[PDB]
């Protein structure tokens, strides 16, 4: 499992679970293509995006749908969302887990990269 | 001052100098019109992007080039950029300081709002 | 101004105002002897607490009473405090802020240091 | 496994492998009698501090030896360790993941609560 993304819930203490999440690799034409999507678990882990073949080196966008997060629990929100567009691969192949902690008015993210 | 941003250094526990910054604000058309844009003082602090009557409601995405800061330190950092999107004035005019807080491979950001 | 305590709050999107924090300074026999104290400002900030004659070279012990912050908001949180301990002017006299980002279940703290 | 402390280094983008973490639980004495202790795997993670059934109620501290870690990297850090205290299973047992992401002059601590 190339990629990984993990969302946490700063307010409850727990895994942020049901955030939709989408993943979109930038074209060549300087547009983001789709790549991949999903739901975080109960962990508030969403797995199984991308294989080792498909995920190339490339700038790749996840798009984490904070939003309707914090809307579905009755909390107001600050942000439209929560982006991270990172360069991958460059130095090889590598795991990457995207994780980030929300709050209504912050969020964090960090990558946690793993040389298998 | 309705906008600041300001961007301090988690490495260095320091003010982040001269990050570029820029804003934008979202069109009928959904596209992102360019708005504002300026770079962070000594103090990590970015003044005067906007003035009460032009910052009207609206979806504001606030663009920092933390790779550059981070490149310039001779650091490949993991994000292109931080990006803060948020709806702004939705319950009438507030004072908004967006902080970003770096690392090379997280970043933490937050909003401070008062009301004038 | 040597050293500041700023609170924000990361639920709100505002200032944590009338935060109680205690300040302590590591003596020879090893124990924490009492050294300043005081409360956050409307605006999550909290000056005067010391000078630059008393704020010698030392291990200092930073107490912010977080959790009566949340019990009076109506939330049980989940930590004690956040206690921030460092060493300051190893390297001679210079002025800190040690800022502090709270929700219910996290917080966040950083230093931002400046030579006067 | 009531107890996990999972350790992130924010600079280098992987986990904080070798961290010595402490445990103590509060007497009612009112001084912090030791309870468990260990190194994070290379995962970051330390499991197997405690059981369901030491794991009582009460307040417990875990002081994380960031300075160690930072000088073993090379890198000036600005605390002296990073200490959490939480009040643990007040409303029935949970398995309880302390997370810390560590930058020289920052750390971010939150608490991930699931209920088996
Ligand atoms: C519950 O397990 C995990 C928790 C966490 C965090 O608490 C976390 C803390 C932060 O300050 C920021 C953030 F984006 C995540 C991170 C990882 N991780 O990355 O592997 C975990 O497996
Ligand atoms: C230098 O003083 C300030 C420090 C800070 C932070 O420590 C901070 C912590 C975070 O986790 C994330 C972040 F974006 C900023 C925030 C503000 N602020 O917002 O006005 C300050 O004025």
């Given at each position: 499992?190339?990629?990984?993304?993990?969302?946490?819930?700063?307010?409850?203490?727990?895994?942020?679970?049901?955030?939709?999440?989408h993943?979109?690799?930038?074209?060549?034409?300087?547009?983001?293509?789709?790549?991949?999507?999903?739901?975080?678990?109960?962990?508030?882990?969403?797995?199984?995006?991308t294989?080792?073949?498909?995920?190339?080196?490339?700038?790749?966008?996840?798009?984490?749908?904070?939003?309707?997060?914090?809307?579905?629990?009755?909390?107001?929100?600050?942000?439209?969302?929560?982006?991270?567009?990172?360069?991958?691969?460059?130095?090889?192949?590598?795991?990457?887990?995207?994780?980030?902690?929300?709050?209504?008015?912050?969020?964090?993210?960090?990558?946690?990269?793993?040389?298998?």
């Amino acid at each position: 499992c190339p990629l990984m993304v993990k969302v946490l819930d700063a307010v409850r203490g727990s895994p942020a679970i049901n955030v939709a999440v989408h993943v979109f690799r930038k074209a060549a034409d300087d547009t983001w293509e789709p790549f991949a999507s999903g739901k975080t678990s109960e962990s508030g882990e969403l797995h199984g995006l991308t294989t080792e073949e498909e995920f190339v080196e490339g700038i790749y966008k996840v798009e984490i749908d904070t939003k309707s997060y914090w809307k579905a629990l009755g909390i107001s929100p600050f942000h439209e969302h929560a982006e991270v567009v990172f360069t991958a691969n460059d130095s090889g192949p590598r795991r990457y887990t995207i994780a980030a902690l929300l709050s209504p008015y912050s969020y964090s993210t960090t990558a946690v990269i793993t040389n298998p």
